[PDB]
Symmetry: C3
Subunit: 597 residues, 3 copies
């Protein structure tokens, strides 16, 4: 009953989900209790064909039926799901709901300034996606191409991603906070034929130089033939290059409000998302179509307990995987409205998150602990001004959540009446790996709890590389078989993919994280074992910051470490031996302080 290895586990009472959760639940839950969960879970590991087969047919609409549920192994890096099947990501996210209820809200868009907020119905989204898709089709964008997206977190970003997917092309979303150099690297690696952006961005009332950074990068991007520019501010001083740049509003007006979607194979790439690794240059993580969409829909439904009547607010950016899966693909596949927030939790005041939740009666809130830490510092008193009683599920993502923040999250936001789901996962998993199912799995503050369907989690002895049997254990977190939404390769560098995930511990997938398993099977994430730092939820590479410092002619040696920060979670401190990081990686990746030694 006492853990000698998992010291976080001693004396931690299980936290049942509050009674108000089930009062607010609009229908009978998708899973009765944890005992039904383990039965379903045991099938997803022992019999994936019988478990995922029906779920894929239930949750997805297919243009061609699949003949094989599961293929490949980790050691060979040839995983595949629903082979032979065809579908379209934008049909499952838009069309099928537009035909059913075209007036149902799809994108609840809360702008940086609330005056600019708006709502797109599923019918509205279909027309806007069709029109943008029509623009790209006339430009020659076809299945197999990649299209870059450099946009803030607003309606246009979602429309761009779905419009690209509508044609069978693969979108590559570049976070709007990246510098011009980072844009150059990602666009060139994928050899994108087109780019979608805007003139300027609004964030916290400040104006972002979006189109300006694109131009600086595009001088070294010979593959980019055309650029679509949305007039977000309509600043007339923004230069467009004749013959290359065209306005979003001008071109979409030329095309009809419906365009047929293009069928793609289950294993055709849906998108590339570039992530910073422990060594070298950022790598383009590739996700399939069917496996990723099933992972997105399945986790959104069961881990958050989403029903058609619900409304999800994921306070994350599509520049990162959190926005891809749980701001766009997850909720739209299920046909529920999703709240797309362009601004910050502090503008105009630290009650923005809560005013939004109250305004739209959101039932699910998904946020990073970094924001929780900041709101506890500057805006705790603002919570009580707003209703917030429509919520029943509160999500945590991107970084470990201390038991302290978990309790504050539960009490001040949840009124001690909501379920909290600390979801562990990463860009390469596509969707959740370990997380407490809402209304099913009791919580231990600071623990991700049980592995999700299809995730056979394990602990490996780092010194011997041998899997650790039994509980009260610690080691590197690894998965024993692949899962539908697992990333399939690194763009045109499958060797880097293998050396990173499949080769370090043959037969397993290597998460790069350490974890612990207590007497009850609950998993406690202990953080990265490589040289990767998660600052404010953003995965950074200490090697990538060191490389930026060395680019300066003054610097000869540079080493980046990590410290504990009560607001940024993890801070990075640079040691240099004889603004550069803000122009190489981006303002968000800047060192906290540079120490000259």
């Amino acid at each position: 009953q006492t853990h000698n290895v998992v010291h976080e586990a001693n004396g931690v009472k299980l936290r049942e989900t509050p009674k108000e959760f089930f009062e607010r639940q609009p229908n009978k839950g998708h899973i009765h209790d944890v005992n039904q969960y383990k039965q379903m879970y045991e099938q997803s590991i022992k019999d994936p064909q019988g478990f995922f087969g029906p779920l894929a047919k239930e949750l997805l609409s297919w243009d061609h039926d699949f003949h094989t549920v599961k293929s490949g192994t980790l050691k060979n890096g040839d995983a595949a799901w629903f082979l032979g099947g065809e579908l379209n990501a934008s049909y499952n996210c838009v069309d099928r709901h537009a035909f059913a209820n075209p007036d149902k809200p799809a994108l609840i868009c809360e702008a940086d300034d609330e005056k600019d907020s708006h709502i797109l119905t599923y019918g509205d989204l279909l027309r806007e996606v069709s029109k943008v898709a029509g623009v790209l089709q006339s430009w020659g964008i076809k299945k197999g191409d990649t299209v870059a997206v450099y946009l803030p977190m607003n309606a246009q970003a979602i429309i761009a991603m779905l419009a690209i997917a509508r044609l069978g092309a693969a979108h590559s979303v570049i976070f709007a906070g990246f510098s011009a150099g980072s844009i150059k690297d990602r666009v060139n690696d994928a050899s994108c034929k087109a780019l979608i952006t805007c003139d300027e961005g609004k964030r916290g009332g400040r104006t972002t130089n979006i189109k300006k950074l694109c131009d600086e990068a595009l001088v070294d991007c010979p593959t980019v033939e055309k650029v679509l520019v949305y007039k977000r501010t309509n600043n007339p001083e923004i230069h467009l290059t004749e013959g290359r740049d065209y306005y979003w509003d001008v071109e979409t007006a030329k095309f009809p409000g419906y365009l047929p979607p293009v069928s793609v194979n289950s294993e055709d790439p849906l998108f590339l998302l570039y992530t910073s690794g422990s060594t070298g240059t950022p790598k383009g993580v590739v996700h399939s179509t069917a496996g990723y969409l099933l992972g997105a829909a399945l986790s959104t439904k069961y881990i958050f307990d989403i029903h058609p009547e619900d409304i999800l607010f994921t306070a994350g950016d599509v520049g990162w995987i959190t926005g891809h899966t749980y701001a766009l693909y997850g909720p739209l596949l299920l046909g529920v409205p999703t709240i797309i927030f362009e601004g910050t939790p502090a503008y105009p005041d630290y009650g923005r998150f809560w005013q939004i939740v109250e305004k739209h009666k959101a039932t699910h809130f998904y946020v990073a602990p970094t924001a929780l830490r900041l709101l506890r510092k500057a805006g705790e008193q603002e919570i009580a001004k707003y209703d917030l009683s429509s919520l029943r599920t509160l999500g945590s993502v991107g970084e470990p959540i201390s038991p302290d923040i978990w309790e504050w999250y539960n009490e001040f936001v949840g009124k001690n009446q909501c379920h909290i789901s600390d979801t562990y996962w990463q860009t390469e998993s596509g969707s959740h790996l370990i997380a407490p199912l809402a209304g099913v799995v009791p919580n231990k503050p600071g623990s991700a709890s049980y592995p999700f369907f299809g995730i056979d989690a394990a602990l490996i002895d780092p010194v011997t590389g041998v899997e650790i049997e039994g509980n009260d254990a610690e080691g590197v977190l690894a998965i024993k078989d692949h899962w539908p939404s697992m990333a399939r390769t690194v763009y045109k560098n499958h060797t880097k993919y293998m050396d990173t995930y499949m080769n370090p511990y043959p037969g397993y997938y290597f998460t790069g994280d350490g974890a612990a398993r207590d007497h009850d099977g609950y998993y406690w994430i202990r953080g990265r074992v490589d040289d990767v730092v998660n600052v404010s939820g953003h995965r950074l590479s200490t090697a990538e910051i060191e490389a930026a410092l060395i680019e300066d002619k003054k610097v000869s040696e540079a080493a980046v470490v990590g410290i504990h920060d009560d607001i940024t979670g993890q801070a990075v401190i640079a040691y240099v031996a004889l603004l550069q990081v803000r122009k190489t990686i981006g303002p968000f990746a800047a060192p906290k302080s540079v120490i000259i030694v």
Copy 2:
């Protein structure tokens, strides 16, 4: 019984279809009587899914089943039909009939000079289409591309169109009477990658300079990579540009008589058709084909044993729908006439009908007016007793011409179908169903399946309830064969059809509805002139006149155009718009 608004209807006796019509009918009619028609019609308006769904499966062959019959609205300009479905236009017009009866006639080709006439079976047609499609495929023509066609009304025009559609590309047929400037505009707007044409054309004994005008236009058409040239006259003095121009016979000889068709979506473009700067009217694939087959079957009463003669040019929608797609979809032979009604003599139309025992005749009133003036005596020299349906298209038909049409051509034994429609509707909108709807001479009668016709008060934009009324003709919901956009200019599409009267489709025509529900077309309300059935833009004629450095009613053509400018000036309009659009007389003021 008394009309105070629709004065055309007063004292107009209903004209039942003659008994000889049903004697000549080869099978029991497709609709028993007007009472079954109204039932079928009322379902097509109240329950389109249950009506068109089954008909789409009956009349068309699908590569992928559709999951939604109908989507979109006019107010949003996002109409779509049979979503998720896949098919191929050339498979439904050729392959499926060639496999069933390869020796059945498909294209009955009557050349300008009868010595050059010939007949292609469905098996022959499949091979010629496959061969041309193979040439284009080897040139890189792929689904999504556009291919221009500048050919007379002969087998090559039909084969080219079906070959382009076989690859999933969209053909853009340019009337062979257009000038080099008009060719340049259409090719560049569509950005065609290839062009199919011939060296010269023969029409009425005259030689037309087809390839010569193409070369003149192609100096300003950078998108055209290759040109396929058919030796219509084999005149050896016609130059081919090395590396761009290739001979039809030489290239088709390199490829096999079967090429797999390419599946396209129900809503993928089938073709562009430019109508008067000119605009490319775009038609979908599945909806357009269903409209063509549905109207051809029920309005004309077409059975497999029948033979259709549409005296129209593929340069216009009439040739697209009722000379090619309509008849071929149903698997019947279609007569493709390259010449004029007067060459070699004014009995040509009737000699053709006799020669091939045609059962259906479809012509424009302008041709009837000409034959009535110059060739009435020739009609009685030919049999013509195989006919039972006589169609009129393109312009209103006077009660006089209706009676002359009925008496001298029909011998008072045929059903007459005055069909109202336009390029953007794809197929018939208002027409008397053969053997079902009694006629009122000069009236198109009842709206067709899926057409919910209405009259709108132009001043208030409010729909007019009740009969004995007049107003702007508008339709209250979209239909399968309705055009979907204007190529790369959807904004003009909306401003022309959907925005003038939101929620309705604006035909640009005024009409009247009498106490029996019959519609009387009263003509255009905008500034478009229909000369001999050709929709012209008076703005386009004025614009051509000003380009010149110097410049700063008809009883046969229906409408003539007179220019007021302040021998050469007529030729200037012939070089900008085309000889067919030339002013009758230019008055210099």
Copy 3:
């Protein structure tokens, strides 16, 4: 009982299949008896829709069902099968077997040197095919493109072909023994965007200069954008051209072990295979996808009696149609292992074939008579060293098999316990046309026996062009309706296709062969009726050889004919006339040079057996060479030339007879 025309059939006892054949048979045979065969055959001719429709659904995996089994006619050259259907060749040959049993052997690869041999499972093959397909896809190779393959008979050649087919492209395999000139012709006719080859080849212990000949050809192949090079020897002195050439291992490492296959139409081109005609320029024979695959699976299954437990050894090269159909597509469609042999039957010794069969317990052996004649001459003593008791079906292909060799094959290889399948067919037929079904059709040594499913064979009177009714007859061999695996065209030259196969005898397919039909319906192939030579079972173009000799500026006239060879069946004899030659001793030095010029233009395998130097060739009034005279002189029938006063230079004949006599041996 006595044949007055088919003299090969007189006094020939039927040879029933030995009882040991059925003991070794692993399951119930696919055909009950000869009567069930005749019933199935009669349906395949009278009711093709009802016969091939069901078989097509049984043996092939479809991505889209077909709506029409059969379309078109021969006279119109628009044959088509399974219209509307979609499938992929690499899915039916790899994926569906890998998913079922990924560990089952697929390619049993026996290298030129046995130390380098290896085995790929269907799981391995799926990964290697997926990776190469990924490279080609990233290079822009898409459905409709052609990709050349210039590789030896090993694992990479099979992987290359299947990877190309996986993307919907059409592969054009170029035999590894061709010179740079033959490569240039084939690559340019097809306008290939990419080429897959290796640095060097090993065959019989000898090193072949593959990439070197490849580079030499590519200087005149502007269509080739990129080249994939496999390190067969890893010889570091082999230059790769920057920007065009890339290493197989380097590029394949960048892509994952699964790639979705691309659905193609039943009638989309699967491959081009260039064949020599009486034309001088090679012809790209085009094969469909669905029809060709069904023919391969159907014939492999029923003619050879292949079961999942079996192991097939087709001793043929993918450079020729026999490797395409019966080393690759046939066995892999059925999911059985296939033995891919890179070397020769003589290296390291003349028991190699038998060492391979014994090593892997092969159940089926498929070889050309030329090899049997060589082994009978040089390697009969090697047979007694090996087991060979796992075989039950012995096939012969490519050329006529004499009754003597039939018996030698039967006794020394089959130990008088195997069924022998003399299979008649050709590059353009895709699969077997006339052959004795294993365990079903009794044999007549030297006869192909009965026509196979869907082949309505006929004999046409050469004088009247009228089909011959009744048996004990001889004439032109023709087929009365098209069949699934029939070639569909000649690449971008359908007119040559029609003029060659469909127009000579309207309503029929013209095989180019003469045959005879005896009183039992058995067909006896009598050889080509056009002037085409089969050297070692392979079609050569004497016109193409003449052109190579003339390229040498020493030569002014050249005429090449075929004659009898006791090992290769037919050899080619060149008659050359030089401009100001003379020197009746320097001749030997000139003859040697002329040979080497053909070896560097077409290839060593197509080099003439002997070059005869003459003063002029027999020419007609119009000035055309009378090759019939050269044929008859070269076979010692200088009597039986007839009246030659039709020649413009009859006095030349005497010199032809003396030259051949004096120079043939030397």
